[PDB]
Amino acid sequence: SAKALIVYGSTTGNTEYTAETIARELADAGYEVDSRDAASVECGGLFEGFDLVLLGCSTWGDDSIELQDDFIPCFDSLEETGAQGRKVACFGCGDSSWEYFCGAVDAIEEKLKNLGAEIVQDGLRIDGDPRAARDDIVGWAHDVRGAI
Ligand SMILES: Cc1cc2nc3c(=O)[nH]c(=O)nc-3n(C[C@H](O)[C@H](O)[C@H](O)COP(=O)(O)O)c2cc1C
C-alpha cells in the first residue's frame, strides 16, 4: 500500500517545487512516489494502481477562477481517472491578493467528492514563494500520511 502518485499543474514552478517537497517527504516515510507534470499524463485510468493520489494545481483567471492550463484536461475528464474510493489530497500555489485564494483547490476537491474520492486532508494552500512555506509543506505531507 506504498504507491503514491503526485500530479501537478504549474506554470512558474511554484506548485512544482511544492510537489517535489511533498514527494521527498513521502519517499522518506517509505512510499514509492511517482511524480508527474500534468502536461505529460493521460487521464484515462490515471490513478490506477496508486494507494494515495495527490493533486497540485495553481490558480489563474482574468476575472474568474481558472485551473492551470496543463491540469484542465484531466479535471475535465476526472470521472475517468479512477477516483471512486481513492484516497486523495490536493495542494496548490496562489497569491492572497486574489479573493479566491487557491480557488483551483476548491474546484478540484468539490469534483473529487462528487466522484466518490476520500479527501484525506483539507487542501494545502501556499501564498507566494513556496520555499518560504517549506515547513508547512512538509508538515502537510506528514499530516496526509497520518490520516490514511
Ligand atoms: C491572471 C492571474 C490570475 C491569478 N488568479 C489567482 C487566483 O485567483 N487565486 C490565487 O490564489 N492566485 C491567483 N494567481 C496567482 C498564481 O496562482 C501564483 O502566481 C502562483 O504562484 C502560480 O503558481 P505556479 O508557479 O505553480 O503556476 C493569479 C495569477 C495571475 C497571473
Could you give the CA distance from residue 128 to residue 73 in angstroms, rounded to a whole number? 26
- Name the nearest CA neighbour of 105 among 121, 124, 118, 86: 124
* Residues 6 or more apart in contact with residue 75 via CB below 8 angstroms: 57, 67, 107, 108, 111
Contact in structure between 77 and 44 (CB atoms under 8 Å): yes
How many other CB atoms are there within 10 angstroms of residue 99's CB atom? 7
Q: Which residues line ligand 1 (CB under 6 A)?
A: 10-15, 58-62, 65, 68, 93-95, 98, 100-103
Helices (H) and strands (E) in the chain, counts: 4, 8
In angstroms, this model's resolution equals: 1.4
- Name the nearest CA neighbour of 81 among 139, 7, 15: 7
CA 60 to centroid of ligand 1, rounded, Å: 5
SS3 99: coil
User: How far is residue 69 from each of residues 6, 15, 25, 56, measured CA to CA in Å?
Assistant: 17, 13, 27, 12
Question: What does 13-78 look like in DSSP terms, one character per residue?
Answer: SHHHHHHHHHHHHHHHTT-EEEEEEGGG---TTTTTT-SEEEEEE-EE-SSS-EE-GGGHHHHHTG
| Structure-determination approach | X-ray
Question: Measuring from atom 29 of ligand 1, which residue has the nearest CA?
Answer: 60
User: How far is residue 83 from each of residues 24, 53, 56, measured CA to CA in Å?
Assistant: 24, 9, 15
CA 90 to centroid of ligand 1, rounded, Å: 16
The amino acid sitting at 123 is G
Nine-digit cell at 68?
Answer: 492551470
The amino acid sitting at 84 is Q
Can you give the residue ranges of every domain in the chain?
A: 1-148
Contact in structure between 109 and 83 (CB atoms under 8 Å): no
The amino acid sitting at 136 is D
Nine-digit cell at 103?
Answer: 480557488
Ramachandran sector of residue 49 (left: φ over 0; alpha: ψ -120 to 50; beta: rest): left
CATH number of 1-148: 3.40.50.360
Residues paired with residue 57 on neighbouring β-strands, in sequence order? 9
Q: Which residue is associated with the grid cell 484536461?
A: 73
